[PDB]
């Protein structure tokens, strides 16, 4: 009950768990430390993919047992952001994602700091505190960035 | 017999050689085994990239239709405006 | 005794063969491994390509989402001026 | 000089080439005998992605050699086909594809027999002896199926 996972880069991370948790429970924990969205991560062992739900006991996983992680390209849910220039960029997000969570990811692509950013969704201004759910932003939706 | 002793040790030595070979081999096999582990996961990755592609192709398709309809919906409202005042 | 010396020569030639087998084995298994490994470059390249194509599809989709938006607000515009007259 | 190209999951084609022949040259030859469009095939020797501009010498590809083939997932140009009321499909095409070849590509996707297919492209019905380039059809273009 102290296992690691490894990306195909070599980058290893130790994950404090017990031989009871489910596959998604592990995935849940990964996002805790690393911040990697659960649905964007697949997990492998003994040469085979693991399915959410079935507990890690079943798949013969032991202590210091080396697990294999793979990051997908998609993420299940996506939204769009239009820049002051007219550019459209696709963000990978989840319902429970604050405006700071969104502002974060926008900084990665476009670059621009999270303080030049003021997001206008259907007329009204967005605010760092409230998540995507509060404003009720379904996938495929398109945000707008304008001058602060 | 001068020669008997000779053969026995000539064999004993050839024997040690082989044992050192297997030790060397067993040592590479150990290296080979943690590396091999990386193959199934390079496949499991090729796969979820393909599915990621498809789920992306799709959304594109759904996007192709939604713009097709909009184009017509717009053309309509235009015929109807021109026949108006 | 010369008697024992012979019983050791034989004793040792049977070790040589038994060991030589444990070599042939490890030799074959090592080859098989080398065959499976010489493919990882390809797995790499493939994972790579797929991701590429994915990216392509994500931009294609990006353009459409940008078109859909345009026609969307152009329908809105028309409607606003049809509601008059 | 001859080399064997093989994709990851089975199927080894053998082909005859010269050392001065470029990669784009060998790809043309792999299409010539397998159909796969050059923009859809990537070659690999010694774990490197070959380049269309350099030759087999530039990479030390001698006789009895093996190049690995990887198929793309798209191709640079694709059109769409709407069954006039039904779902829309994506086709992987090349500007010099004939219309019959477009029917075959449709049949692979929706079973529709090329005989039972009538295609219109922004008015105008597409004949079979002609190509997409002949009707100035380009990427993103959408064809109508009747």
From Swiss-Prot, chain B:
GO CC, any one term: cytoplasm
Region (Leucine-zipper): 63-84
Effect of residue 62 to R: Slight decrease in TRAF6-induced polyubiquitination. Important decrease in TRAF6-induced polyubiquitination
Chief location: cytoplasm
Effect of residue 61 to A: Impairs linear polyubiquitin-binding. Abolishes linear polyubiquitin-binding, no effect on 'Lys-63'-linked polyubiquitin-binding and impairs NF-kappa-B activation. Abolishes linear polyubiquitin-binding
Consequence recorded when altering residue 49 to A: Abolishes linear polyubiquitin-binding, impairs 'Lys-63'-linked polyubiquitin-binding and impairs NF-kappa-B activation
Stretches the record annotates as Self-association: 1-85
Modification note: Polyubiquitinated on Lys-26 via 'Lys-63'-linked ubiquitin; the ubiquitination is mediated downstream of NOD2 and RIPK2 and probably plays a role in signaling by facilitating interactions with ubiquitin domain-containing proteins and activates the NF-kappa-B pathway. Polyubiquitinated on Lys-26 and Lys-50 through 'Lys-63'-linked ubiquitin; the ubiquitination is mediated by BCL10, MALT1 and TRAF6 and probably plays a role in signaling by facilitating interactions with ubiquitin domain-containing proteins and activates the NF-kappa-B pathway.
Cross-link Glycyl lysine isopeptide (Lys-Gly) (interchain with G-Cter in ubiquitin), sequence positions: 18, 24, 26, 33, 43, 50, 62, 66-67
Localization (cell): Cytoplasm; Nucleus
Positions bearing the Glycyl lysine isopeptide (Lys-Gly) (interchain with G-Cter in SUMO) cross-link: 18, 50
Effect of residue 26 to R: Slight decrease in TRAF6-induced polyubiquitination
Effect of residue 53 to A: Abolishes linear polyubiquitin-binding, impairs 'Lys-63'-linked polyubiquitin-binding and impairs of NF-kappa-B activation
Keywords: Coiled coil, Cytoplasm, Disulfide bond, DNA damage, Isopeptide bond, Metal-binding, Nucleus, Phosphoprotein, Transcription, Transcription regulation, Ubl conjugation, Zinc, Zinc-finger
Gene Ontology biological process terms, A to Z: anoikis; B cell homeostasis; canonical NF-kappaB signal transduction; defense response to bacterium; DNA damage response; establishment of vesicle localization; negative regulation of endoplasmic reticulum stress-induced intrinsic apoptotic signaling pathway; positive regulation of canonical NF-kappaB signal transduction
Domain remark text: The leucine-zipper domain and the CCHC NOA-type zinc-fingers constitute the UBAN region and are essential for polyubiquitin binding and for the activation of IRF3.
Protein name: NF-kappa-B essential modulator
Taxonomic path: Eukaryota, Metazoa, Chordata, Craniata, Vertebrata
Gene behind the chain: Ikbkg
Whole-protein coverage range: 253 to 337 of 412
